[PDB]
Ligand binder design. Sequence first.
Ligand SMILES: Nc1ncnc2c1ncn2[C@@H]1O[C@H](COP(=O)(O)OC(=O)[C@@H](N)Cc2c[nH]c3ccccc23)[C@@H](O)[C@H]1O
Ligand SMILES: Nc1ncnc2c1ncn2[C@@H]1O[C@H](COP(=O)(O)OC(=O)[C@@H](N)Cc2c[nH]c3ccccc23)[C@@H](O)[C@H]1O
Ligand SMILES: [N+]
Ligand SMILES: [N+]
Lengths: 326, 326
Amino acid sequence: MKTIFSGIQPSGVITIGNYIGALRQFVELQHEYNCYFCIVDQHAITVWQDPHELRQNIRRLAALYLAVGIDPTQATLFIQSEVPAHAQAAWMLQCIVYIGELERMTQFKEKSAGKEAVSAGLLTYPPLMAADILLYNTDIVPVGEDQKQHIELTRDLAERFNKRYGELFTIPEARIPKVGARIMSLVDPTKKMSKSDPNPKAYITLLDDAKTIEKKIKSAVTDSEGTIRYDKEAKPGISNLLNIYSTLSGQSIEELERQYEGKGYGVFKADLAQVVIETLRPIQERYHHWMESEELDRVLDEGAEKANRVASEMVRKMEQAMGLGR
Amino acid sequence: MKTIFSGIQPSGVITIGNYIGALRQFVELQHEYNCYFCIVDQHAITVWQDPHELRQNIRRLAALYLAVGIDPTQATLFIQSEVPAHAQAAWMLQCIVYIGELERMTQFKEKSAGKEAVSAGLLTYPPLMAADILLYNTDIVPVGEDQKQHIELTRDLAERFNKRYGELFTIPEARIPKVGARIMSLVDPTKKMSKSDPNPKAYITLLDDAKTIEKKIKSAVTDSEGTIRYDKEAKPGISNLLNIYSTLSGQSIEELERQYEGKGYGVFKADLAQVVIETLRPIQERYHHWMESEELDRVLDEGAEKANRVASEMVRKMEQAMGLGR
Ligand SMILES: Nc1ncnc2c1ncn2[C@@H]1O[C@H](COP(=O)(O)OC(=O)[C@@H](N)Cc2c[nH]c3ccccc23)[C@@H](O)[C@H]1O
Ligand SMILES: Nc1ncnc2c1ncn2[C@@H]1O[C@H](COP(=O)(O)OC(=O)[C@@H](N)Cc2c[nH]c3ccccc23)[C@@H](O)[C@H]1O
Ligand SMILES: [N+]
Ligand SMILES: [N+]
């Protein structure tokens, strides 16, 4: 059976954009593929992190993965730093990637923009992400659209390694949702919904309460058309709301447009807020249960055990190929 | 007792400059300090390496370390890639070092000079070297003058980590020989003697035979003074030969100047060649014995075991400090 790998950085904010673009896919695909889902703590430290908050954010993200439905009998959930292979593999790949290649990454240009002394991990983020993927002989990497470039570099690195040292890596392919690959800010729908937006009304976190969801959806920027129809260019706000509605409800954009034919944005927003609440409430309840359980650690212990068995073997093969060691 | 750490890259050429600046110190200090001497294979791959040659160069360097007198009961000799902690620690430090800092490294500017697509490991070499040193709670790092800058960055990184996350690292200090810290090319004594000089007459390898040593010392560029006196600026060639002679023979520069008072370069060179031969012959004999022995692997197995115990514990402390993991 084919293999899937995907990772999410532990942070103070996990959004419905993370859920729609990524987590929803993980749950969908977990029974049909061998799956490795990672909490990428080593990527998190590419920017300063308060240590106590990081430790908590790592547990919170593990709880959210399990709360949304990732099943430990179907998938391997683990913390990146707990599998030394990722750092070892990242080093080997950093040795074959070119500085120019890292400098062209949009993620790097955006995260380093207007910066004054950029910490090096920001620049060397990609090789570590490529290691994450390649270590598991990954076929498919389910992500939102914003990870496409990183996966393109990963494919380039795998091909480069294979040409130089012998065929070892499977060339992985991104799997990006048709609808909801790039959920936009509710405040400015021409911008992506981001975990780090300074305006909390831009995103909905997976832990937002009902009153908070309602406020955010209601305030969502729209237009002066009063017509619920998809049109990314002309109606970015309504289009983005339609994507959220479609993905969470399971109704097609066409179904929703018909349903709301002749209706205004008010009822549409009230109904969408309810769909978001209906989605997040059961997740939140399961999330608190995991946060209070010793089983959360057991699940992560088991995941690192499995991940370490597979990744450590791939690292041995990589070293053998480059002639490191003995 | 204090701790020493030092590393050497496995390569096709190990010179008498490596011996005089570094290996001679290792043997001198091994009984008085806890010592970790490393074969830095992960640093070697910062540039392309033929895999079969690399594997061999790693064994050759282990044999040379043991041949020169490093004693496995006094020091821990091991291969960098065999201790995952170095890669893990390198990642954490890459996250706190600034890109500007890496770009100013002379080693980086020289190795990347006139280059067209510099591979990223060339740029990220320092954090891995800082990890090598800091992992062992190192006090002293014996090297030749060319490593001074890298050790200055390592001190800066250790201080930066300690300020941000809590005092964890000892701030290491370089130990550079008074005489022979920078042995120069025999072909152009204004340049350092380098393992990668395209002109094989520039260096003497630890495996050079007698006839070869004689040829190299005899051809060594001098001056038209016919006076054997130290003067780096005016007489770089003779000065460099005096350093080699002094270090290998144990005679002071003053003793040699007196001894050669009124003599010409011919006898001086003939006698120096003999001193180099007398030095390298016993090393070469022990080197072949190690190359043919299963004990070479046993020694490296034991060294990685010890290094892994110490380094892995420091990695745990580092992660705890930054809040990685659990
Ligand atoms: N507005 C949005 N709309 C739709 N999808 C979105 C939105 N915002 C985020 N995503 C998706 O969420 C996942 C995690 O996001 P991160 O920023 O942690 O995603 C990141 O920071 C990666 N570098 C983490 C990573 C590290 N190693 C990996 C290996 C494979 C895949 C992913 C990774 C991703 O799938 C991301 O595309
Ligand atoms: N002409 C010369 N005269 C005097 N000393 C010289 C001469 N040429 C070389 N050396 C010294 O030899 C040692 C190994 O040299 P490398 O180029 O492998 O040295 C290198 O390439 C380091 N990056 C390896 C390293 C990796 N991690 C470390 C941690 C601590 C100390 C050293 C390391 C060094 O002591 C070097 O100063
Ligand atoms: N599965
Ligand atoms: N010792």
